[PDB]
Subunit: 400 residues, 4 copies
């Protein structure tokens, strides 16, 4: 074999069998994705070599028949802590990895919520890459992380696939790796009996960048005003709820702060509410995006996601990105739906390639028979940037 994923297997081997299995169920797909997004051969090697060295050991054991890990991830259908996404727009497609870095004691008494692995991987990325910044990670780990006794209590109140506090994504963009993290607010909520809204914004308002950026303060103030009468005021875990805080692991003054809502109910009137922030936003751009999202929902179990991204130095809220949950829906149907949507958008080249490229991404499964390979679809509209489509795959479900 002389494709990059094969050459790297040959050159590098595996320290253990779980890493081997992770490679044999993910790396071909990942190489295919990078080829399909028009990454040069040299970036295909860069990213696959990076994946081998940094990501495979972070993925822990490979859950399979007869071997049941101590730690079960909610990132995927089979309990594997891995997802692969593509972000599609007019001009280009970029690849992103999503995971949870599993510590060697994760899911046991010494580490019940897998509290250490993601920071360890980030520290290793910090000596690898000059632009990686840990300050926001550490701030939120301080504010929503829990001690061992509190993690043990959280595990009594959570199903096994939700024994987590954090997760990591890595954008493979511009020849670089750009890490981002998401912290769950649910375990602190449950353990402290504090409303999720309160502990989320209490955490955000202690950021150093919040204390010296009036615009971010103003934008956050606008978001709280929208969310306060929509999310619970009490301590309950009920929808819509503020379930994740996201940061970029870069200079705090440039990092996007994200507040992620989780909810089960969605219709056209809820879309509009979320997208326009209950009529706060009315410009042409906003309204053009709304139409797009509506059209997507017509064309097409996990909660929906609504993610409000805010950047220091911007006072006004933008529309959120909306996450459609696709678990349990047929992957052939979804592919047909995505083609239709791409036609609607005028992205005729994406439309013509989507199906073929999908089958080629997952050559060991019949896509037309699966319902768990497409797991999420995010849709976004931007200023100074256009419309975007994020497609999240359960790469392992696409391989076994």
């Amino acid at each position: 074999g002389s494709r990059p994923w094969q050459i790297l297997s040959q050159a590098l081997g595996f320290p253990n069998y779980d890493q081997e299995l992770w490679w044999q169920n993910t790396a071909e797909t990942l190489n295919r994705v990078l080829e399909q997004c028009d990454y040069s051969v040299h970036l295909q090697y860069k990213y696959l070599a990076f994946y081998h060295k940094y990501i495979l050991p972070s993925l822990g054991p490979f859950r399979r028949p007869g071997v049941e890990p101590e730690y079960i991830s909610g990132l995927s259908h089979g309990g594997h802590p891995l997802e692969i996404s593509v972000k599609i727009d007019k001009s280009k497609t970029i690849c992103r990895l999503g995971l949870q870095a599993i510590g060697p004691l994760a899911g046991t008494a010494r580490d019940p919520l897998n509290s250490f692995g993601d920071r360890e991987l980030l520290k290793n990325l910090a000596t690898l890459l000059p632009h990686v910044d840990l300050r926001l990670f550490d701030h939120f780990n301080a504010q929503v992380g829990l001690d061992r006794a509190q993690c043990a209590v959280a595990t009594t109140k959570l199903i096994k696939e939700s024994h987590n506090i954090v997760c990591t994504s890595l954008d493979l963009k511009d020849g670089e790796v750009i890490p981002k993290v998401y912290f769950s607010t649910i375990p602190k909520g449950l353990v402290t009996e504090t409303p999720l809204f309160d502990l989320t914004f209490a955490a955000i308002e202690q950021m150093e960048v919040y204390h010296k950026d009036a615009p971010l303060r103003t934008a956050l103030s606008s978001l709280k005003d929208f969310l306060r009468p929509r999310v619970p005021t009490d301590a309950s875990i009920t929808p819509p709820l503020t379930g994740l805080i996201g940061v970029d692991c870069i200079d705090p003054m440039l990092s996007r702060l994200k507040v992620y809502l989780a909810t089960f109910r969605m219709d056209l009137s809820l879309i509009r509410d979320y997208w326009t922030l209950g009529g706060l936003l009315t410009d042409a751009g906003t309204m053009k995006g709304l139409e797009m999202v509506e059209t997507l929902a017509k064309t097409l179990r996990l909660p929906f996601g609504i993610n409000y991204a805010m950047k220091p130095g911007t006072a006004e809220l933008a529309p959120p990105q909306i996450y459609f949950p696709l678990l349990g829906i047929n992957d052939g149907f979804i592919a047909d739906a995505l083609v239709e949507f791409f036609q609607y958008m005028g992205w005729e080249d994406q439309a013509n390639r989507y199906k073929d490229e999908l089958k080629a991404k997952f050559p060991n499964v019949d896509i037309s028979q699966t319902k768990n390979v497409h797991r999420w679809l995010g849709v976004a509209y931007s200023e100074t940037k256009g419309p975007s489509m994020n497609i999240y795959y359960d790469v392992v479900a696409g391989n076994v």
Copy 2:
């Protein structure tokens, strides 16, 4: 003896680790013996030191092997001190170190930003009561990105290329970690006043927002400190140079603000000790007499103001006197005197022979590096205590 047994049972992953052991483990075991730790605790702490501390210490600086990272914790550049905390009843052993990352002091890690947290992570899975939330809070507020670390290394001596240090109290039968964060790099690189960036980091703590007594304590301390430390960006000691916390539940953790200064005379002892005349009670004045006597009987001076959630009132600080450059035999004789003055006759009688036995490779009458620091304190609750910091490597080479 336990240090020898563990060496036989465990060996060493590499030669630097072996040299570290050979230059410190015998001394540690002696200290632990002298302090009346049981044999099972001597094993406990020495096994712990082997597995967790040895790899954290980096290379062992020695003739012909100049490491990339040089520590200001000792005279030879070694990132280790062993200290004792003495009161009348008992003596407690403590380790002070800098956990050295494998790229420390090179362009990928100019200020050794990662090794202490790595060590602390291993402790959090070892020990049930270790809590990293205050670490992570202050690492967020005074940590720097790579480019900023690189700038700071151009404006600071080799021995000050650090942001954090770790201490481990070998108390009761537990390991109790604490950490200090240095404010200087961030202040240098941001050209922010140390006073402002210190108190900003603290005012953003979760516990500060939760606890009215802590807030009251800190406003008295800012009042006291504001006029005495610089208002602009410079490094003009006296200055707020470190922030210390305990790696415990944030609500129990002491918060420590350390001033560094190069001037101490009777006027300034009085001023630091009493918070400018704020504290006038007999307990305070008894501690002041102590400190005055100590200074009569005998690196910047240190003043450490410590506060706890729950308590609105400030207490006298701990004062640190550097001992570098002063004969170690004179120091011992002076401490015997001072111990006699306190009425700690048993500590007076054993101090000098037990010291010689800690450092059998050296002549304490001819050395000037072995006692590096002395800290002195008085609390209403616990009473008087004295902290003696040894350059264990200098006491073994």
Copy 3:
């Protein structure tokens, strides 16, 4: 207690290591206590077990986690046994294991060819008197390449996918390693007779070429064995199934040739014990009485013929009786009787209560897996001894 102290001081790198400790360390500490090892040696051996053995043991097989490699050393597939060597004066503790490589039992390492030597390498830098030359000699003569290992796995049960095993004697205050190499895989894959490949490997040893007495001993043994083991390639027990050496200076090392057989009756005990009537002295006959009595009082049977450089004459072998399937309480009562017969009254009186205390989680009256083997020997020099092999995991779950 030392096993608890070391757990507190060291923790665990991973959960499998923790489960190994939790299922074996308490028992080990008990054995070491019962054998009158000092506390400092209990620490020595337990610290060693933590650092060197735990990572060598691989995953801990348990419900829902089926490892890729399954060991024939115990009933649950765990690659560990603890054994005692009892004589009248004293009792010695020994560990038996298979060091599991991280790809063991998969296509990149089908017969676990590498983990034991890796462990042995770590011991050679730990311990001054460890010598790997006989290891390397027999690993050269009976080891296999990847493709051959893969063929052997198609012709052998899961529990026999191994070429080597390691034992560690906790003797005096030292760790003394020995290893056994299995001849079956090479014989299966090469379709060579076990007898020929066994004696070929041995005749190529450096020490064999150097030492005329060893050569004399071995020709008597080949004479004895040639007619009793197969001449063609088959696996027809009785067969020369293992070669054992000590990891010491080749000139001191015992060379052991182990027969495995499924038939033992009074005729065959006599034949194996006396080397077909070759050994007729009173010492031999006294040992035979012992073995006959043992077998009256109470997996293949084992016969281990041991030879030393320097000695021309063969000695009676050690005979191994498997105990799998027999009540552990009956076994204890039978051993008490047999100990009384030997006049080891002190061992008779304490054997059963000390056993229950080794394995407090089990009822020995209801178990059949805990005693796995019994070995018995008699030497002119050292006298009678008995080796009892426990499935420590089975005694703890």
Copy 4:
């Protein structure tokens, strides 16, 4: 930078600073060598990725001003345990790595002769590559390796750069890695007070393959007859001497057994003696090779090497390969000499490229000013194969 050596630095980083330094002083050169030998981009990645993972940690500390390792190698001028060679013939050029795998206690009381590192690396290569075989390694480690007390004595009788028992080469051929090892006989000789000839052949005659291969026995018998009256009969370490035994780490029945002589004296009458084995070989091929070697020596401190390679199933001895030592001779001169020799051989393409490619291999040093970059030149003639030129470089001396 988008060359493979740069991309891999970017993707992989370094676990420690010595590995970083090894990379910054070797990897560019190694990439250049692979490019120059017409290795595809995919093999350039395969080998550089292999080098990063397996070789960099094996190389120990990077000896440099202010940092003096405990273990000093004789493989190179600066004490670095690394060499890079090219084997040149009519049709092709292949790259080879030579090293000593340094253990973490090498050169101290627990490991005075660096006795463990090379086997550890080989075991890791054995799970990486299906064709790697450890049986011959283990045989010779058994026969010429020493216990710790014996290694400590050896170190009292050897200069610091000769505190070794073994070294490893890795041929980067046909898209694979083919390991070979060389065991020194000197430490066992010194410690046991045994003649080097005796302990060399005693070791060889105990090989399992020797016991079942009459041809190898016959060929060895012919070599002993040649060497017996030429090398010492006593225990002295004097020339010519049998100083290394070499094996290939492959199926024993296919591995070439090598006996390496070290000597300081060489002239045309000694060349002929070694090459023809004192007149044992007289065929046309032999005599044509002799002429080549003579011509090379005319065109042009370490000992010369003479390496007799024997394969199971061949009864007759072939001519040895002859190693010319080049340390201390000007590297510009050597380059001019090699061009002349290549012209003589009719290898006009090699002749025209040699100088330019050399400067391009070592872009941070002026080659015309150095005398330690070319360290050895081996010359060989074969049956079923032709003439060969092996050029060994002190890559670190070419970089600092």
